[PDB]
Curated annotation (Swiss-Prot):
Expressed by the venom duct. The chain holds residues 16 to 30 of 31 of the full protein. Disulfide bonds join 2-8, 3-15. It comes from Conus lividus. Alpha-conotoxins act on postsynaptic membranes, they bind to the nicotinic acetylcholine receptors (nAChR) and thus inhibit them. This toxin inhibits alpha-3-beta-4, alpha-6/alpha-3-beta-4, and alpha-2-beta-4 nAChRs. The cysteine framework is I (CC-C-C). Alpha4/6 pattern. The modification Cysteine amide is found at residue 15. It comes from the Eukaryota. It is found in: Secreted. Coiled coil: none annotated. The lineage of its organism: Eukaryota, Metazoa, Spiralia, Lophotrochozoa, Mollusca. This is Alpha-conotoxin Li1.12.
Length: 15
């Protein structure tokens, strides 16, 4: 998912 990629992972670290 997006949360599997650095930028989105920094948006939501809970994701």
């Amino acid at each position: 998912g997006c949360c599997s990629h650095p930028v989105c992972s920094a948006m939501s670290p809970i994701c």
